[PDB]
Symmetry: C3
Subunit: 288 residues, 3 copies
Amino acid sequence: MFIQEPKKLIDTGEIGNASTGDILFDGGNKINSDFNAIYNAFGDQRKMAVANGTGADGQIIHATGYYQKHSITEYATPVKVGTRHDIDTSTVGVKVIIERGELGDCVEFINSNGSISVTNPLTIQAIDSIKGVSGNLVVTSPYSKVTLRCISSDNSTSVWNYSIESMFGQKESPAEGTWNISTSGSVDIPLFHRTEYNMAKLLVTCQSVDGRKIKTAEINILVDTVNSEVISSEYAVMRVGNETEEDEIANIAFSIKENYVTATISSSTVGMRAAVKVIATQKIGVAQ
Amino acid sequence: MFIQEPKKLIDTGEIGNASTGDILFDGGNKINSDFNAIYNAFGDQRKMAVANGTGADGQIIHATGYYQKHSITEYATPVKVGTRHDIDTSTVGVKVIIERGELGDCVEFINSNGSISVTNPLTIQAIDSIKGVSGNLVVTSPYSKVTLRCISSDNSTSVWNYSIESMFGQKESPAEGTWNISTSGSVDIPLFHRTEYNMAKLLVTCQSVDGRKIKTAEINILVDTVNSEVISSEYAVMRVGNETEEDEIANIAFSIKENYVTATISSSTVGMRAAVKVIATQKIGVAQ
Amino acid sequence: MFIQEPKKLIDTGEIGNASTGDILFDGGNKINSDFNAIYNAFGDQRKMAVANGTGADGQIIHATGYYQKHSITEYATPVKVGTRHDIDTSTVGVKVIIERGELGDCVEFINSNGSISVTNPLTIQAIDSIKGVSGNLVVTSPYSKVTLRCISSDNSTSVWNYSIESMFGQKESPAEGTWNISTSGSVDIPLFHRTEYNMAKLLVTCQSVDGRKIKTAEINILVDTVNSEVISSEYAVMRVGNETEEDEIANIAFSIKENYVTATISSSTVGMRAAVKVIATQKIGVAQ
């Protein structure tokens, strides 16, 4: 691997005190050290073995950043903080050890070839320990994104915590916010175009300006594109200021309006607010 | 657009072999090429048209990175790997083509002005193909964040996969971990301050040290701030080592303790563990 | 704090017109300015107080980027766009003000020591305003990740929107895609290895090639590792082209096959498609 050297700056404090040759040589080397540091942090390090990362196929600065591909033997020694790794466990699980860190230090892993599995896992040992983990962190989720951050260092205590996420998938939410129920006692909230999702899950919480009346409900909806309708299933309903055990406080209905799956929320109570959030969706794609 | 040139390094191998003029000119140009490469990867490229990105309003290095605003005509030719784009489909949908990639290569898109929609979409063609997609990837989610990564190259096979997420929203989880049920047979787990959310959804899974007894349940809770209480709706309950079809294995209750919405988990069985995770929340904000 | 100066480039347009001393001094200073800009955007700025960030413990380029630790007095003045902050509200809540932005400008916050709470919050004022927020954005979620992006500038209107996420947690999805139901009328979809999760939540949507028949359902499953079985709870079922109010359109079953929790989907209708997505999971870890 390439272990950069800290930042070097040109000592302009000299020059009319050390002739050219000496200054240009010392300067250039410092400049090269710095650029190699930067380029290797945002570019493929495997290219250093060729013209020191120069040439027509030399290193480039990736705006998206870069995750290094290192070999098993290279992971025999602790990885530096701030580094990024694209793990390959295709032929065998790999273990990575992270040097002791300091508050905020971070190391991120990616799994572009999806080799991570239970038999060929990504084992991570963060010098000292990982919170909520006994010993090493064993990652078995293919095509995953693992982020480790140091949440406590001071002195003799270097503790890290982590996050694990899928590199891919449709995670977007088509709608999230709060809307007022107009004096007319009803409000339409466009969720998404009829063609974007087949199914969606939302949470709806309606509360009066004084918080005396409030209702919350979870709703799964199915988009029936052929009949231009939307089927819904509301459950886990909870209310507080309901005058009667029959009084809804707020009713939620669905339909397609202007080609947009739409939530229509109405209520008797005046000055009712309604928070609407889509927390999941499903779109039938193409098999395989 | 600005298409950087690979990394260039100063040939200190010369100097006391090529006079100053030649070395300073060749050096400076290389230095400028490199810095332009870096600055354009982390800064606004539209500024290059002014003093080559210099001046009081010249380019700067964004620690957060930067997403370039390019024109339609500029997207007529394949985009390089490692680039970032802030898409604008306000007047018309835009198509972007990504050059053939290699394992790990990445390209990320953002939609700051929220112009993406079904009529003015973001169409992406990743040289060769995108997994789970027939032809081009058509993005219609406004204010979205799209990430494309190459998951297979080798030779004649350049396949990419993608992720789509919302740029905005409250996605945080107020609590996730595992707690022991003390010998007293009960444990309180603070979830969040009474004022942070009106509604929350959690998953609870309790298992004995030997895995003979286990229960899982999903729970939606409503924070009644006025009466300082928390209403709950537990469902999808599943158990395995239940001695009786009336034996709960573990009971979950909610209330406000010390002003924190709190989960109280108790069980007869000794040595019971309980995993608690909040997978969704809803907070009534301000309309509009 | 360190407020970088815009990009500076070496004026090769001179040299055989201004002797060495003048060019090397002016050049070096520009080079240093640029590198300080880069290093301070991707490295610890607190090190500038020592040898200007040089030395054996000097600044380094973090591939993961870096989030600066600034003091209360330093936040008395507006923060520049593109900066990253690791907030510390351990002794008192801190307020940060963001200078007016332009479309796409971004500022990101992290909370490595988890000091953020309701009593010691992170208050953010984005010059002009934040959408869906009345006044300042008040963050009370510990160990959070806050991202602010400018979604509208033009002229007199500088509006921002934000996202809040947990820095840590297991958020990965073990499976998401679409599968064809073979002519045999049944398909097995491996979800994850039996040891990865104790509980999972999935959404399943099956639709015929012509969209006349379709069913959607939400399912929570519990992995019974001791008996090598999987218990399930299917609900919120919705159908459209059901010939009978008893006709399922598609049946979903679960079990462990080859040691992988597996979904088995079967249907009478020919040419049925099935979208399967795991939107939540729970793994019993170690208490504390």
